[PDB]
């Protein structure tokens, strides 16, 4: 059924599963019109489809042309997400297809269930975890590929870089969610923390800097402090 902290280890067992986050699929700017009305302008978006065990990220770029002449875009966006995830599953060899798809927002359940009727043995589940996957567009290399797209495109990433050589999936997922929560809460400070020391760089084939085991402990502590600092600012604590 629903996925939470009691069955949290289930994310890192050997049953293939994907998280699907649709929060960056339909993205707009809001502006006044010459007549003093308000208008939206869409910008490119993306579906964030992630295997939490392996780190493999299937980033489907949603180009603004898909909205052209369409109505009820927020509703359409969920169904387009479900269509694209369905198409991704069909494109994968049988032994790579997921056994479970976990959606970060419950509004994705019926669209995905209806698109996956041909796959009655793939479970479609919500989660009670608050996952910061909306902050994916704060990762500069992801944001750049999305904004430069001139057409629909699928791009594959490993969102854990090379971490699984040294840490478990459980730890890697915790590190990722802490990094994304920090980027979501205070993007500037998070990026400052990640790049402060010029001698630690991001490899061309990576998304995050090349921290040693010790430097990652220092970084993770600074991220927790940021999140706590922002919580105190928010609530006057």
């Amino acid at each position: 059924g629903a996925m939470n902290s009691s069955n949290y280890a289930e994310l890192f067992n050997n049953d293939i599963k994907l998280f699907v986050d649709d929060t960056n699929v339909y993205r707009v700017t809001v502006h006044k019109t010459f007549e003093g009305n308000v208008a939206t302008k869409a910008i490119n978006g993306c579906i964030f489809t992630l295997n939490p065990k392996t780190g493999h990220l299937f980033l489907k770029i949603i180009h603004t042309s898909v909205w052209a002449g369409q109505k009820r875009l927020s509703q359409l966006a969920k169904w387009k997400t479900a269509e694209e995830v369905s198409a991704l599953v069909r494109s994968l060899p049988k032994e790579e297809q997921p056994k479970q798809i976990i959606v970060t927002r419950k509004a994705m359940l019926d669209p995905l269930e209806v698109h996956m009727l041909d796959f009655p043995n793939i479970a479609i589940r919500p989660t009670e975890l608050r996952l910061p996957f909306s902050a994916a567009m704060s990762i500069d290399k992801l944001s750049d590929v999305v904004m430069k797209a001139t057409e629909p495109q699928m791009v594959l990433f490993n969102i854990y870089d090379d971490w699984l050589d040294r840490i478990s999936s459980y730890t890697a997922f915790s590190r990722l969610t802490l990094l994304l929560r920090a980027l979501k809460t205070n993007e500037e400070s998070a990026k400052m923390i990640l790049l402060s020391d010029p001698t630690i760089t991001i490899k061309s084939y990576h998304l995050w800097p090349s921290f040693t085991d010790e430097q990652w402990i220092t970084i993770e502590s600074q991220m927790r402090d940021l999140i706590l600092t922002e919580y105190g600012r928010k609530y006057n604590v």
């Binding site: 019926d110 209806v114 698109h115 009727l117």
Partner: protein, 300 residues
């Protein structure tokens, strides 16, 4: 007019005949029901005084045979039987009438209620939902499950209503997922009306039969079917305008007839609020909306 004699009434029982009901005392000299209007199906139903468990009853049409009721003390219920000796049936009916041991079907002349609830219900369609081919009449009770209820358990004793499932490959054309899930017109018009039911009259017949089994027996799967068949129409953007007109009349008389004290168990708040206030047809059911708002405003 036609008659259903009763050999005896050995146990105290509330007897229903269509929307009417009366109490018979243990071993009271009751020998049946006369003046039953020809031209409609009918239902004769039972609830035992000493064990309100199992409401049960029989759908029948006096045009299809001569039927009588006799208590079976082994199986512990009133059973319908067909009398194949016409001459015997006439003598049994006449004697019981002459001794005034029958209640009269208490139809008011102004009163179209039963026609309005059974306009589209035919015995031959009942006999395909309730499969017992050796009888011309059909037994239904409170606990019988539907075919769909059993997929989610003795198939011989099941209600074979047409399965309606909005998240099924039957309801959703590949490539039209959003369209068909948000607008059920494909499923209503092509799959159900053109494909399975063949016409709106058969669809309404099953809808009316489901309502009557929910009301008279408290049959839960029948209530599920009734609401699903309403929701399927209401959730379709494209419906024959005459088809919604008849839907409003059908529902009006069902809501009018429902016992006020059973509304909490016979009416699904979600479906009715969606059909009356949110659906494509929210403005197409004026008579039903008015009676629902004046009789059961709590539900909404």
């Amino acid at each position: 007019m036609n008659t259903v004699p009763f050999t005896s009434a050995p146990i105290e029982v509330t007897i229903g005949i269509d929307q009417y009901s009366f109490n018979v005392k243990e071993n009271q000299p009751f020998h049946g029901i006369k003046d039953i209007p020809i031209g409609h199906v009918h239902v004769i139903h039972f609830q035992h005084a000493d064990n309100s468990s199992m409401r049960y009853g029989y759908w029948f049409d006096c045009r299809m045979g001569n039927f009588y009721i006799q208590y079976d003390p082994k199986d512990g219920l009133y059973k319908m039987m067909e009398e194949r000796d016409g001459a015997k049936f006439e003598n049994i009916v006449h004697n019981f009438k002459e001794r005034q041991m029958m209640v009269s079907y208490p139809k008011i002349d102004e009163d179209d209620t039963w026609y309005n609830l059974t306009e589209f219900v035919q015995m031959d369609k009942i006999r395909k939902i309730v499969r017992k081919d050796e009888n011309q009449f059909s037994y239904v009770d409170s606990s019988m499950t539907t075919v769909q209820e059993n997929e989610l358990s003795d198939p011989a004793h099941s209600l074979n209503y047409t399965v309606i499932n909005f998240k099924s490959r039957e309801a959703i054309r590949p490539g039209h997922e959003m369209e068909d899930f948000l607008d059920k017109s494909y499923y209503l018009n092509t799959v159900m009306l053109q494909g399975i039911f063949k016409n709106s009259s058969n669809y309404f017949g099953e809808l009316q039969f489901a309502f009557l089994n929910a009301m008279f027996f408290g049959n839960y799967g029948s209530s599920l079917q009734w609401h699903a068949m309403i929701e399927l129409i209401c959730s379709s953007a494209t419906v024959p305008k005459h088809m919604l007109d008849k839907l409003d009349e059908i529902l009006y008389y069902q809501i009018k007839t429902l016992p006020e004290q059973y509304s909490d168990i016979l009416l699904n708040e979600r479906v009715w609020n969606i059909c009356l206030y949110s659906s494509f047809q929210k403005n197409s059911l004026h008579n039903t909306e008015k009676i629902m708002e004046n009789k059961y405003p709590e539900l909404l």
